[PDB]
Nucleic acid binder design. Structure first.
Ligand code: SO1
Ligand code: GDP
Ligand code: MG
Lengths: 52, 824, 189, 94
RNA sequence: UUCAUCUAGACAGCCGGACGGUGGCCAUGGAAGUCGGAAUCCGCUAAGGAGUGUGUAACAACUCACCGGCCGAAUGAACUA
């Protein structure tokens, strides 16, 4: 009820990224840094849990 | 509309003028409130919040003669009887669904507009497919697709196109080929629509005939010109077989135009308060307002506007007589599976012809209980013949076979009654195909049961369910002075639910096996407030473990008397599953002739004929897979010792040294025993605790291990949901035996051995992992040995006996062969 | 540049023994169809796809083996390579201008023309009807086999191919995002 | 006959049954390797082969899906040997 | 501080192939490149790893390595305080 091609468009700005492994945050699946200071610009990520 | 008790009996005799069916529904799509509108609308009365139980509700069908003039069946008249049973919803209650299917010929399909044909729809849809029963689609909640959503006309057309085409799949895959054209398409007017909470419903065929006049085109070509590649032309006034014209401009198919367009203009006008369309479109579509119906507004006003256009009974009871099959031509291909016995047989042929005066056949699927302080009724369809108030009916049980007794109770009926949704009436008879209720058969039959009158007639089908009572929970009392109420309440829950199963545990608890948590929990609070009515203590179900050995004893066992005189030297080893099986199954008996008994165990089980013609016993209780093989020769008084040695052995094999439980695969080969000279030092209070301490050392030296019970669960589910299930085995040791299926059906029956310890919530996580799509079929298969050490309070086997000895109030430590050993 | 240096030497050796060659351009190829077209001429015509090793071949068209490299050299654009042979031109032209064959819908690929499809049966069992389900097209049960009720124009002229629709398109054998292995330029002696 | 890696393609023309034999890499090490490496090793892993085989394996690549597209004898001196731990033939391939 | 790509033509960008034996030795309830260990080969060109992840019940399928198109000089990997 959302169309397979229109669903890739929804993930393109809601979950198709990577989560910070310290304070967690949305950053591209190719990006390799953090935009925060609580870590001091770290490199801890993971391709945001592909939920099924 | 009220009808006297006799008007019903006259209505009952006309099989061509009586439709018997059920309701194929999902959890919540609108089937209970849809059928509720047919009663307060056109329902037969007696002479003058979840689905827990069902009954066959009755109504009157008063049609037009030219209406029954297009029904392909033998029929003479328009005085029909609506004998519909309100089939239970959700899941875990797919028990009463197999029972409502048995006491009917067709079924009312209740799907949704947006939640289309979900899991429970195709579950009860694939249920009707294997029952040779005919399906009839009715998409309810079409108004929610235009109120909370507000869908367009051509968009809502492909919405029902999807719900329909998805049913053309479930059915054209699991159906019978002798039935042929049984798939419901609104192309013949076999799929209904409407709204149950507002009291209305309609069909394409209703307005096809209703507008056949306004176009001159008969209802058959009118509705075949509404659906398909049929588009009208409001420019030239031609119904063209294309979506565009010569200009290449957009057309709205005949359906959305003449049918739907009218209804939408009603919504926004009535609902949003536009009296510039109320009386206007009222007369444009041939409708009228009257009294306080004119005084209502919006939501409540559009309800009465449908009661003025397409009330309930309209499209509902219409497709019931026109396309639904009555016993006449229905049981004319149903007799086969419906009755388990010879087809070219006397009573079998009588049902295919349907003789209401000949061979009396009446299988009661579920015996319907009451507020009559514990007594019930026997709800069953009368296949052939007429049941009277005090007739000699043969109460045949599900075990009975033509040629013996085995549950055969031919008794006379106390009184006969009629079922009306929740109302019983003191009646007299009921014919071939129609269903009624008879009191008094209960105090003779057990839950399900076939009832004949002929000796050569076998038994009628007793379900097959394909739902299985996989779940199991321990049940007891919270006060021992009322334990008697506990067992009696349990006995009535058996004759209460058709798919429910009550049996005693190997430990000493009361096991309750259900289809699921919901099913079980409902029958637990019903057994809490009704059946029993006393406080229960329910905890997880405790398992029984047979203490098995995995090799021969590291040294020879030694143990004598506490008085000190005669000693015992046995060497306990493990009996292979195949030979230990020939004991408990029956190929080598403990009372068999030792001569030819030894001949079979040597050439087919690979043994020494010496120790074989010398078996002392099988155990425990004289027939288990634990033997006492004679191997000594220096024993002059052989005839004064064998007896009491096997005596403490029957107490040793019945009571184990690890945690007070039996053993399995323990072949005790006795090498030597120090005999005496008199029976004063070889008797009663002598040989008992002697062989007792002797077997303790033998088992604790041949490799101690805990053996547990294993299942054979075949979960039937399509190949598309299999992903989640395969990982539930990679979760709680689901070792696959095989995986078989048919060339044209996705539904996969998967064989996997399942551990009792890894089944304390198996059913819940299984439908959660792959939707309700996963149907578990649990049935115990074999006993598989663990692999860990039971004296290790940290290994698999040891963890079990740690918590097990703490519960009995026994010793916290696990005593070895050192503690029970007699040495110099 | 180990292999860059040894290939320069390679192309020159073949370019001397033969007098007939073709500037075979592509980009719309397939690992399968490509290597299997070389099988077609494993002794009549062998392919040798070049690159910036061909800008070095501008400095090789500067080598003066036979400087007619003027009417050949600048035809270095698109996935183009070599085609060595010593038989007549129209005979080998028919062979290579027949040597190019179809490739499937890469679900999200370059959609070029509008596709129509007759309202008949495909003779397959109704299991792929769940895909025609979340799209919206009536499907009849004829002998049970999945039947298309419309001569439907599903894909429009030039759009982004959706993953879902191009999958059931592979079920109809639809393949237009391709060509094969043809030619850009010819030249003899 | 076959147990593991046995792909037998079925082409049916309305009942007329005809199954073609793609004779994979496991199929060649059975049609060439007699009773010892053909059957009797169900409960035990098959890892024994070294002895000279010759030209017969070139026609064994003919039964094996011929999708290589160049030379027969040439591609078999690769398939049977390095991927096949049962049959080494001429000690030069590894 | 190194390492060794590079106008002979790279790196960022994006275009299109991403093969075969082969559902490879087995191992298999099921593993076709993508649970596991062990072999890590040549047929052939521009390339295709017994194969880089996601995902399948296994496949399929997509995507990377590798390779051709065009851009056309840096500018990247690895470490130092
Ligand atoms: C067809 O319905 C069947 C199947 O669901 C399955 O065979 C189920 O098994 C019950 C148990 C059967 C085991 C064997 C027959 C030997 C050991 C028995 C058990 C005791 O530990 C293990 C399972 C679970 C029960 C423990 C909790 C007491 C058993 C029992 O009834 O005692 O029984 C019902 C009636
Ligand atoms: N949107 C919508 N809601 C309905 C309709 N019919 C009934 N309901 C709602 O559903 C509630 C109970 O539904 P229920 O009878 O459990 O559905 P069933 O289990 O499929 O029979 C009622 O109280 C209504 O408010 C309908 O046609 N459309
Ligand atoms: Mg309900």
């Amino acid at each position: 009820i959302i169309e397979p091609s229109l669903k890739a468009l929804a993930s393109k700005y809601n979950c198709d990224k990577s989560v910070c492994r310290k304070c967690y945050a949305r950053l591209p699946p190719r990006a390799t840094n953090c935009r925060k200071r609580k870590c001091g610009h770290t490199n801890q990520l993971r391709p945001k849990k592909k939920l099924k | 509309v009220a009808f006297t008790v006799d008007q019903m009996r006259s209505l009952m005799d006309k099989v061509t003028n009586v439709r018997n069916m059920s309701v194929i529904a999902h959890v919540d799509h609108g089937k209970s409130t849809l059928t509720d509108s047919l009663v307060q609308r056109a329902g037969i009365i007696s002479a003058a919040g979840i689905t827990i139980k069902s009954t066959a509700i009755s109504l009157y069908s008063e049609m037009s003669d030219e209406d029954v003039k297009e029904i392909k069946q033998k029929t003479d008249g328009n005085s029909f009887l609506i004998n519909l049973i309100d089939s239970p919803g959700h899941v875990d209650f797919s028990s009463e669904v197999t029972a409502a299917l048995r006491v009917t010929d067709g079924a009312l399909v209740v799907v949704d507009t947006i939640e289309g044909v979900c899991v429970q729809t195709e579950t009860v849809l694939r249920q009707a497919l294997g029952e040779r029963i005919k399906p009839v689609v009715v998409i309810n909640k079409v108004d929610r697709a235009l109120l909370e959503l507000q869908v367009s006309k051509e968009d809502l057309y492909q919405t029902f196109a999807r719900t329909v085409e998805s049913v053309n799949v479930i059915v054209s895959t699991y159906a019978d080929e002798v039935l042929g054209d049984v798939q419901v398409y609104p192309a013949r007017g076999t799929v209904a629509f409407g709204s149950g909470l507002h009291g209305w419903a309609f069909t394409i065929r209703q307005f096809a005939t209703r507008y056949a006049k306004k176009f001159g085109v008969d209802k058959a070509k009118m509705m075949d010109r509404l659906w398909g590649d049929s588009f009208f032309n409001p420019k030239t006034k031609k119904w063209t077989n294309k979506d565009t014209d010569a200009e290449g401009k957009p057309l709205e198919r005949a359906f959305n135009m003449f049918i739907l367009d009218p209804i939408f203009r009603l919504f926004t006008a009535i609902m949003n308060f536009k009296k510039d369309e109320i009386p206007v479109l009222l007369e444009k579509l041939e409708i009228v307002l009257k009294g306080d119906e004119k005084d209502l507004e919006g939501k409540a006003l559009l309800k009465v506007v449908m009661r003025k256009f397409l009330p309930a009974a309209d499209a509902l009871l219409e497709m019931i007589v026109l396309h639904l099959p009555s016993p006449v031509t229905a049981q004319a291909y149903r007799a086969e599976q419906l009755y388990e016995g010879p087809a070219d047989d006397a009573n079998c042929i009588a049902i295919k012809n349907c003789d209401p005066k000949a061979d009396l056949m009446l299988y009661v699927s579920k015996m319907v209980p009451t507020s009559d302080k514990g007594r019930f009724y026997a709800f069953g369809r009368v296949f052939a013949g007429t049941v009277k108030s005090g007739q000699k009916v043969r109460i045949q049980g599900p075990n009975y076979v033509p040629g013996k007794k085995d549950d055969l109770f031919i008794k006379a009926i106390q009184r006969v009654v009629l079922m009306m949704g929740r109302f019983v009436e003191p009646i007299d008879d009921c014919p071939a195909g129609n269903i009624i209720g008879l009191v008094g058969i209960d105090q003779f039959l057990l839950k399900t049961g076939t009832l004949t009158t002929s000796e050569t007639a076998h038994n009628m089908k007793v379900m097959k369910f394909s739902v299985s009572p996989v779940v199991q929970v321990a049940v007891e009392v919270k006060n021992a002075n009322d334990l008697p109420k506990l067992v009696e309440g349990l006995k009535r829950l058996s004759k209460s639910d058709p798919c429910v199963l009550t049996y005693m545990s190997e430990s000493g608890e009361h096991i309750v096996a259900g289809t699921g948590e919901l099913h079980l929990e409902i029958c637990l609070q019903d057994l809490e407030h009704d059946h029993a009515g006393v406080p229960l203590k329910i905890s997880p179900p405790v398992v029984a473990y047979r203490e098995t050995v995995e090799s021969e004893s590291s040294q020879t066992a030694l143990s004598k008397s506490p008085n000190k005189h005669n000693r015992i030297y046995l060497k306990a080893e493990p009996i292979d599953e195949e030979v230990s099986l020939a004991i408990e199954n029956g190929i080598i008996n403990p009372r068999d002739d030792f001569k030819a008994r030894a001949r079979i165990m040597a050439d087919d089980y690979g043994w020494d004929v010496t120790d074989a013609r010398k078996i002392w016993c099988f155990g425990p209780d004289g027939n288990g897979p634990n033997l006492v093989i004679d191997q000594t020769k220096a024993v002059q008084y052989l005839h004064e010792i064998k007896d009491s040695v096997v005596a403490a052995f029957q107490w040793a094999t019945k009571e184990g040294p690890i945690f007070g439980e039996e053993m399995r695969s323990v072949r005790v080969n006795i090498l030597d025993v120090t005999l005496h000279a008199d029976a004063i030092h070889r008797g009663g209070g002598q040989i008992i605790p002697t062989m007792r301490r002797a077997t303790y050392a033998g088992f604790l030296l041949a490799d101690p291990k805990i053996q547990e019970p294993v299942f054979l669960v075949e979960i039937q589910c399509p190949e598309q949901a299999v992903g989640g299930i395969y990982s539930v085995l990679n979760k709680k040791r689901g070792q696959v035996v095989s995986e078989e299926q048919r060339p044209g059906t996705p539904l996969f029956t998967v064989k996997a051995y399942l551990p009792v310890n890894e089944s304390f919530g198996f059913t819940g996580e299984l439908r959660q992992a792959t939707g309700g799509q996963a149907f578990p079929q649990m049935v115990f298969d074999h006993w598989s040995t663990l692999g860990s050490d039971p004296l290790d309070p940290t290994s698999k086997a040891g963890e079990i006996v740690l918590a097990a000895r703490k519960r009995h109030g026994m010793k916290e430590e696990v005593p070895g062969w050192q503690e029970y050993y007699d040495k110099l | 540049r180990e292999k860059k240096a040894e290939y320069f030497a390679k192309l020159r050796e073949y370019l001397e023994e033969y007098k007939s060659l073709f500037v075979v351009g592509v980009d719309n190829v397939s690992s399968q169809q490509m290597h299997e077209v070389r099988k077609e001429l494993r002794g009549r015509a062998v392919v040798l796809m070049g690159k910036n090793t061909m800008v070095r071949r501008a400095i090789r068209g500067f080598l003066s083996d036979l400087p007619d490299f003027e009417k050949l050299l600048p035809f270095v654009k698109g996935n183009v390579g070599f085609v060595f042979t010593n038989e007549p031109l129209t005979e080998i032209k028919n062979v290579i201008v027949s040597n190019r064959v179809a490739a499937p819908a890469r679900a999200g690929a370059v959609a070029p023309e509008d596709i129509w499809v007759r309202a008949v049966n495909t003779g397959m069992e109704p299991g792929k009807t769940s895909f025609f389900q979340a799209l919206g097209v009536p499907t009849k049960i004829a002998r049970g086999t999945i039947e298309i009720v419309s001569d439907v124009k599903v894909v429009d002229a030039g759009n982004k191919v959706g993953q879902s629709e191009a999958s059931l398109l592979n079920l109809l054998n639809i393949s237009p995002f391709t060509f094969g292995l043809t030619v850009v330029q010819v030249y003899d002696n | 006959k076959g147990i593991k890696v046995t792909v037998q393609l079925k082409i049916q023309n309305r009942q007329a049954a005809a199954s073609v034999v793609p004779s994979a890499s496991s199929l060649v090490i059975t049609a060439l390797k007699e009773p010892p490496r053909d059957r009797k090793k169900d409960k035990n892993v098959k890892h024994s082969g070294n002895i000279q085989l010759d030209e017969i394996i070139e026609i064994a690549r003919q039964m094996r899906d011929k999708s290589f597209g160049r030379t027969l004898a040439s591609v078999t001196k690769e398939i049977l040997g390095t991927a096949q731990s049962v049959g080494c033939r001429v000690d030069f391939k590894n």
